[PDB]
Amino acid sequence: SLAEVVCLEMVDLPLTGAQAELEGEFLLGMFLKRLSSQLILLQA
């Protein structure tokens, strides 16, 4: 069926876990959030 193509597109792939939790990372709540995510990556 690919012998007659009409229109197409190119899409970017999905994320790793790292970048997902990284987005999740982002007053004191800010600091502790940052710390927690850092410790998680560390343990990883």
Next chain:
Amino acid sequence: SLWKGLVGIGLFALAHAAFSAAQHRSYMRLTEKEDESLPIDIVLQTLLAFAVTCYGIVHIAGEFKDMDATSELKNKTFDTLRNHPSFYVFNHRGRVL
């Protein structure tokens, strides 16, 4: 020597700030926002690290001294001055012992 530990703590905290800011930058280039500034927390952290580190490095840098010669002559007497080591001679009472 606590000031050494103080300086090492400033350095460690500063490095932590740099890491946090690099990963935040990655977030930025990833969400294609490229509009916002840095969170305050990072800024405060790095600045305090800088100030503390300077206050400690001033102490551990060394110690000043007077530029008046006779200050170091206050405690001195002939006994030191008189010896002249390059003119020593041993034909004296001590050789008895």
